Design a protein around this ligand. Structure first.
Ligand SMILES: COc1ccccc1[C@H](OC)C(=O)N1CCC[C@H](C(N)=O)C1
Ligand SMILES: [Zn+2]
Length: 140
């Protein structure tokens, strides 16, 4: 689990969105595994606007932050799961790092700010949904 809190937005994995998220919906995209809802309180996270390919992510199944090198956002095949059928997920970045299903939502960050959240993984891989192209997260 986990979310990004920027401005008056909450960014979560679409597959983990709550009823309150759906009832306060701003934007969602199944092909990216992302959903954004509106918040009453202002958040403290800032979004990175950069070209970094190295950063640090939070792994809840280890209670630890790990440095990683990650691929550029791209269209990657993700196996059928209990949340989606076998499909291509867009704007996904892969790295070598520990992950388990419940690690979705952990933040990936660089020196510029938040880059994305854990969205996929398996066998010593972890995948992150990029948010750096979502420029509107920085405005009302
Ligand atoms: C962090 O997730 C894992 C880590 C290690 C092993 C397995 C997983 C997850 O179960 C397969 C996984 O990759 N997904 C399940 C939830 C929806 C994700 C998606 N964005 O399509 C895919
Ligand atoms: Zn950066």
């Amino acid at each position: 689990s986990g979310a990004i809190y920027v401005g008056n937005y909450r960014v979560v994995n679409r597959h983990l969105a709550t009823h309150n998220d759906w009832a306060n919906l701003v934007w969602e995209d199944s092909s990216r595994d992302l959903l954004v809802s509106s918040t009453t309180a202002q958040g403290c996270d800032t979004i990175a606007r950069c070209d970094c390919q190295t950063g640090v992510y939070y792994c809840s199944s280890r209670r630890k932050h790990y440095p990683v090198s990650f691929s550029k956002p791209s269209l990657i095949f993700v196996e059928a799961s209990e949340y989606y059928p076998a499909r291509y997920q867009s704007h996904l970045m892969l790295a070598v790092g520990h992950s388990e299903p419940g690690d979705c939502g952990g933040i990936l960050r660089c020196q510029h700010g938040v880059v994305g959240i854990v969205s996929t993984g398996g066998n010593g891989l972890v995948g992150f949904a990029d948010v750096r192209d979502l420029l509107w997260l920085d405005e009302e």
